[PDB]
Amino acid sequence: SKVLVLKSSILAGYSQSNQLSDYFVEQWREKHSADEITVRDLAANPIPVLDGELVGALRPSDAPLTPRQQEALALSDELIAELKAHDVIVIAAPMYNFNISTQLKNYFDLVARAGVTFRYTENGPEGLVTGKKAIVITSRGGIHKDGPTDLVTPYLSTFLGFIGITDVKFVFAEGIAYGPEMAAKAQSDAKAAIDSIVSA
Amino acid sequence: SKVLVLKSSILAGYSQSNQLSDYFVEQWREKHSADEITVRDLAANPIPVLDGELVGALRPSDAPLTPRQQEALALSDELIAELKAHDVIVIAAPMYNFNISTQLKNYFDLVARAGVTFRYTENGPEGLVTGKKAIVITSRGGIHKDGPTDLVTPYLSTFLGFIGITDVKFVFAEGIAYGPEMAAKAQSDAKAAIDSIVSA
Numbered sequence: 233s234k235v236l237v238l239k240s241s242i243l244a245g246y247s248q249s250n251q252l253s254d255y256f257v258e259q260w261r262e263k264h265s266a267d268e269i270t271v272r273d274l275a276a277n278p279i280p281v282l283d284g285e286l287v288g289a290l291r292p293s294d295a296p297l298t299p300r301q302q303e304a305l306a307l308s309d310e311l312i313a314e315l316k317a318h319d320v321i322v323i324a325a326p327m328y329n330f331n332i333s334t335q336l337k338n339y340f341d342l343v344a345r346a347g348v349t350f351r352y353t354e355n356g357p358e359g360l361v362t363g364k365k366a367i368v369i370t371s372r373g374g375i376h377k378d379g380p381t382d383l384v385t386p387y388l389s390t391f392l393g394f395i396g397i398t399d400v401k402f403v404f405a406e407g408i409a410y411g412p413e414m415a416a417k418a419q420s421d422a423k424a425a426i427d428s429i430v431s432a
Numbered sequence: 433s434k435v436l437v438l439k440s441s442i443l444a445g446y447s448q449s450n451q452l453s454d455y456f457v458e459q460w461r462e463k464h465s466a467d468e469i470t471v472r473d474l475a476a477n478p479i480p481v482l483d484g485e486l487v488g489a490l491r492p493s494d495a496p497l498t499p500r501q502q503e504a505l506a507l508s509d510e511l512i513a514e515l516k517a518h519d520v521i522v523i524a525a526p527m528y529n530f531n532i533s534t535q536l537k538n539y540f541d542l543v544a545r546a547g548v549t550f551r552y553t554e555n556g557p558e559g560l561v562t563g564k565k566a567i568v569i570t571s572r573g574g575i576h577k578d579g580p581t582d583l584v585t586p587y588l589s590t591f592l593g594f595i596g597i598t599d600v601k602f603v604f605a606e607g608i609a610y611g612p613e614m615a616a617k618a619q620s621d622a623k624a625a626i627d628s629i630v631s632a
């Protein structure tokens with residue numbers, strides 16, 4: 233089995249979601265030591281913003297590409313081939329200003345291509361990234377789970393389902409900003425959630 | 433009064449949300465010819481991505497800022513002063529991959545600052561951008577309104593409410609990708625909605 237781990241926090245070593253993702257990788261290596269694990273850090277190695285030039289590479293028209301466009305198409309091809317090559321997809325999704333981090337958003341914007349990761353049919357869209365199992369590790373300062381201020385969870389569920397990844401489990405670490413006690417309990421509960429996932 | 437218009441599409445003159453925003457401005461200048469109108473195009477003049485460095489300017493620590501951090505702080509202060517200086521806020525919010533555009537998101541990430549545009553109190557968050565009225569002009573390829581795939585609408589309501597802009601009117605232009613007839617009808621209906629808003 234091959235595991236891809238996507239890190240998207242801007243807080244580096246202090247990141248709650250990067251710490252839980254590392255715990256995830258540690259546990260998986262112990263319990264399934266034959267599996268290869270690939271870790272991509274979307275903050276350390278940023279994906280460019282999808283602008284008018286880059287959208288012209290992914291939704292091309294009848295003209296030669298610019299060198300920048302060609303480079304963005306190569307990066308997009310590389311990210312998609314990596315996504316399709318792996319079985320278990322662990323996505324670190326910190327909440328910043330009620331959304332996912334731009335670092336993760338830029339990744340998703342290069343991964344979503346018609347005829348590559350999805351296509352529209354007469355019955356609606358069909359996802360082309362098939363047979364995957366995803367785990368979202370999502371950290372928040374406050375408590376939002378199951379309430380009107382959590383658009384991150386349904387958004388991730390919607391975008392992932394769109395490209396074909398409909399088996400998604402969520403690990404939450406909420407209330408981090410209430411203090412070190414609340415954060416430690418949040419981390420211990422998340423680690424126990426990760427344990428059940430790794431041991432299944 | 434003073435109207436601020438924020439454009440966020442990556443499609444330039446072909447933008448459906450930009451065309452509707454221009455129509456809004458035209459109608460506003462006819463019905464309210466004394467009002468000041470400011471247009472900021474977040475794609476033509478892009479805001480930087482909130483990364484580790486920039487978050488250190490917005491959420492500072494006990495050390496001198498870098499040149500780049502000082503520059504980003506000055507840009508954030510400019511965008512916030514501009515937001516607070518206008519009474520009516522028009523936001524063109526095209527949907528890309530079930531989210532807002534990164535061009536718009538980068539704007540929000542620089543505008544959301546503790547003690548400046550919001551603060552946390554014992555009774556929860558309180559917005560500091562007060563007395564405003566907003567109009568969201570949001571274009572989509574498909575039909576999403578009032579269904580589970582529209583996370584853009586509640587996200588904008590939530591984010592705008594958080595900084596204090598609770599009075600928000602949504603204008604939709606959906607179904608653009610079904611073809612020229614459907615797009616024509618979308619524009620026609622959205623312009624009618626804009627006419628009611630402006631003439632009220």
Ligand SMILES: Cc1cc2nc3c(=O)[nH]c(=O)nc-3n(C[C@H](O)[C@H](O)[C@H](O)COP(=O)(O)O)c2cc1C
Pocket residue numbers: 241242243246247248249250326327328329330331371372373374375376408409487
């Ligand atoms: C730029 C910024 C924006 C944030 N916005 C929110 C917010 O919208 N809601 C929330 O509950 N916490 C918010 N937080 C708190 C983070 O969600 C919390 O620190 C979480 O652990 C971040 O995950 P990370 O440590 O892996 O980066 C924000 C933090 C930062 C850095």
Ligand SMILES: Cc1cc2nc3c(=O)[nH]c(=O)nc-3n(C[C@H](O)[C@H](O)[C@H](O)COP(=O)(O)O)c2cc1C
Pocket residue numbers: 287441442443446447448449450526527528529530531571572573574575608609
């Ligand atoms: C990068 C890209 C992603 C898109 N993703 C979606 C999608 O998630 N759902 C949808 O209904 N339309 C999607 N569309 C269609 C646009 O929402 C539609 O073209 C809309 O008119 C864009 O607004 P604009 O013309 O002002 O840029 C997408 C278009 C592009 C360029």
